[PDB]
Design a protein around this nucleic acid. Structure first.
Lengths: 78, 136, 94
RNA sequence: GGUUCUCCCCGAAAGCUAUUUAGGUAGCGCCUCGUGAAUUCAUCUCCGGGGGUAGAGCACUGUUUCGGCAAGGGGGUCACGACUUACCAACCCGAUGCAAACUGCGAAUACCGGAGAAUGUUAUCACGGGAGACACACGGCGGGUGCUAACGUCCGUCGUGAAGAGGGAAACAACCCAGACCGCCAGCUAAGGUCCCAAAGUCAUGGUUAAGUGGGAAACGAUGUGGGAAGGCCCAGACAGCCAGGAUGUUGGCUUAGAAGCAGCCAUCAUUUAAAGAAAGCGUAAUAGCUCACUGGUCGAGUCGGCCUGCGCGGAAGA
RNA sequence: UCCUCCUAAAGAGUAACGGAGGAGCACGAAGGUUGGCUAAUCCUGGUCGGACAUCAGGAGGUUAGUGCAAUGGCAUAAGCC
RNA sequence: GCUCAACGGAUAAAAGGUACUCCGGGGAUAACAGGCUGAUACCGCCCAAGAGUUCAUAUCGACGGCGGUGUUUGGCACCUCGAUGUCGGCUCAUCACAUCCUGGGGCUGAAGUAGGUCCCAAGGGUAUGGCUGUUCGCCAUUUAAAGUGGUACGCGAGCUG
RNA sequence: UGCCUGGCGGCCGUAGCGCGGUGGUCCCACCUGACCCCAUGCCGAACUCAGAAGUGAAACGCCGUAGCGCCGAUGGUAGUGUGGGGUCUCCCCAUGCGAGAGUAGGGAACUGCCAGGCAA
């Protein structure tokens, strides 16, 4: 007979690129993600694609803050 | 034939039948029909093993059916080559793990329930046993 | 009047519990109050005949271990999935 | 299709993207040679990490079983109004399961970064010269599909073959052990074996099997047999036989034809008594009647019925 | 040809004539800034007005919305004025 | 300024037949047959609602399940395209038993003859004809019987077409 | 130094709901009047102004209560890395990791800076 599926897309290569304590030079993408699964914290910016880019050549560190426990991404400064 | 009503998707994957069961304790009735072998029960096999069991416990009493299939099985027609899409849904199986209680029964003596679960066990492809509701 | 002789476990885990289960025995534990939970090692063939009575799951048990006597009750029991045998019993020290 | 002398060292791939492209070709991943570089890289220990898979669960989306309250609905019944209500039944409540396109939870592995000892002919990266290859196959694991069929097909990782000789599984690339520089009528060993063919235990101890099981096959059936935990009845006398009773008003009701010990509703009483159920079956158009249960004598020591297990039997018929 | 989920085996990637759906647009406001606000679905009362229009109150909590099929995300709101 | 949608676009511009065919290759890829499996087919088994005057098991056995064989229809494409001749017929046959008859038995809803089912047993035998190219199938007449399958759906370096 | 209260944080349900009680000389809220500063796609309900008569009613803070929510052992089970095995659509052995659910139980938050009131 016939089929109606067989269609997908170029896998977007998302996820975290730089993990925990791992020195990142300013402007380095850390998390490439759909929505704000991981939120931007200290010294880390958020782009127009919810890519949290580093902003200060330092470390990383994820956390949980407020009263929603949203992994948060900060940048220890070394 | 126990058939679901408006499932989310028409066809699903094959899937493995690994692991243990969850419905081990006899909860609703006093005497249960617990499975020992690892297999699966099509939708015709529950209804066929119910007719040969309910008639032996003549209609006064109450019988609980602890399993429901909710899993479609495809089947390619004859003289059809491989591929060219997924087959059409024909019947519905219930994945049975070892330890799953199949039927339960209350309102009958222990002798009547013993000689009636054996009549339903001969309709099933899996090896079953006779269990009793224990305290706690 | 229910007396169950038991011992103290020296190895614990999954591999220690399956060696102990193939020798007609099964582990248990006594806990409650403010004392430490004692790992309980006892025989299966006696206790399987004890739980056939309806007073085994309601009255006060007397488990004898290390020469002592501890008055316990029955809280949680794990049946085997397809065999008439036991795996573990929780005893409340009361 | 063929491609002609010898030796040494290293040594692949059958993958991705593109392609009027699928059996061809380019780049990259893989190979070789040279050059230049950082305790470069790997293994291990510790630390910092992100999950959301296996598992588990029903807080969310769905599916489904039972019980209670229960709107609504339903069949029927009355005189613009409504009385009876064998029935189906929404949301919560208690319990129970299922899901790749469900996750209030959540591993082991795997991956990234940092510190440290040891080891490995720098095994790591970049550039330059030269390629080959882009038909893969099998086995384990996680799978889609097919019939949880195929030496079937499509994926991810590892191993093997390809491109690896040797030993073993009788023969048998892909299964197991193990990587052939050469020579020796030297020893040790892994997988597998030690009655002979065919090299090595007719080796020691304790059990099981009667089937040629071992040396194909399930549902299911059966006083085969061994071991274990318990129970009923019992030398104030058990279990299977032998000898006596094994009945009485019940033609009881039932649509009023008969079901009458043994047809359907049924209660499933109660006396005569050492013992008899208004019957489990054997006979009947219903009865008659053969019969054990339940009771005594005889006899005399154990018997009977279930459970988990190890080896067994049948089911088991091809040229 | 492109986009979303699963298969996809908890970094990324990953095939099949595998299972489900969409796109080849639109907007000068539906963009930017500032200020303010929190719904869906039920229950009760009330003129036409009824299962559902508008008004008042209660529970409920984002089950609503996000221009468009799906995933992730959104109360500091990206939702509404 | 291109639904250059065959969307990394070969030209601005392009449909069909070959049984009159032809060349270079492939079992990288089908048709006959072999091989693996057994969805399907045939046969056997398990429970027992019921039909059978009462009576499941003389006999048939629903709803379901479990197996065997490789005889049908199917799946894959592992050998074969530097050739494996193939439907039916004639001659010649060989093997298995899931036995058509002959032989020995059990049960019977077996009075006898005549039956029905099942077990053992393959020693021997197992139609002539009208139709169709037919294997099958229909019909006439026999016979104790006119068996079921395997062997490249046996057999074309044996014949035919 | 204590008890309170107000503003700003960490932590985010052991911290959040329900019931009962309590607080006004301080503070806070309700409230008072609005012609004016401002403003309602109508209304000063909200926002904003000028004041303090009354109350702690609603809101908010504090205490008790487990009636829910929530945290959470120890043991056991599922799962799984590596090496083997089997009656191999699944399971076991040796070793390492170790859930989820559930049970005993804990549990009516802790605390930093500054200002004001009160007792010292």
């Amino acid at each position: 007979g016939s089929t109606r599926n067989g269609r997908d897309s170029e896998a977007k290569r998302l996820g975290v690129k730089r993990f925990g304590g791992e020195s990142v030079l300013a402007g380095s993408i850390i998390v490439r993600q759909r929505g704000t699964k991981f939120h931007a914290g200290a010294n880390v910016g958020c782009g127009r694609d919810h890519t949290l880019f580093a902003k200060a050549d330092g470390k990383v560190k994820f956390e949980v803050k407020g009263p929603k426990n949203r992994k948060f991404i900060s940048i220890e400064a070394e | 034939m126990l058939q679901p009503k408006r499932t989310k998707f028409r066809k699903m994957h094959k899937g493995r039948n690994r692991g243990l069961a969850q419905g081990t304790d006899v909860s609703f009735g006093s005497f249960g029909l617990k499975a020992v072998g690892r297999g699966r029960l099509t939708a015709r096999q529950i209804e066929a093993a119910r007719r040969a069991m309910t008639r032996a416990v003549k209609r006064q009493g109450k019988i609980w059916i602890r399993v429901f299939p909710d899993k479609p099985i495809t089947e390619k027609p004859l003289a059809v080559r491989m591929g060219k899409g997924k087959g059409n849904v024909e019947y519905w199986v219930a994945l049975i793990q070892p330890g799953k209680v199949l039927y339960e029964m209350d309102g009958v003596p222990e002798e009547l329930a013993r000689e009636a679960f054996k009549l339903a066990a001969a309709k099933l492809p899996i090896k079953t046993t006779f269990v009793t509701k224990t305290v706690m | 009047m229910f007396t169950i002789n038991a011992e103290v476990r020296k190895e614990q885990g999954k591999g220690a519990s399956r060696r102990l289960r193939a020798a007609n025995k099964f582990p248990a534990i006594i806990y409650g109050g403010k004392e430490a939970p004692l790992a309980i090692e006892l025989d299966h063939d006696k206790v399987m005949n004890m739980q056939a009575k309806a007073e085994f799951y309601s009255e006060v048990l007397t488990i004898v271990v290390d020469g002592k006597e501890i008055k316990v009750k029955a809280q949680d029991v794990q049946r085997h999935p397809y065999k008439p045998k036991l795996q573990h019993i929780d005893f409340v020290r009361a």
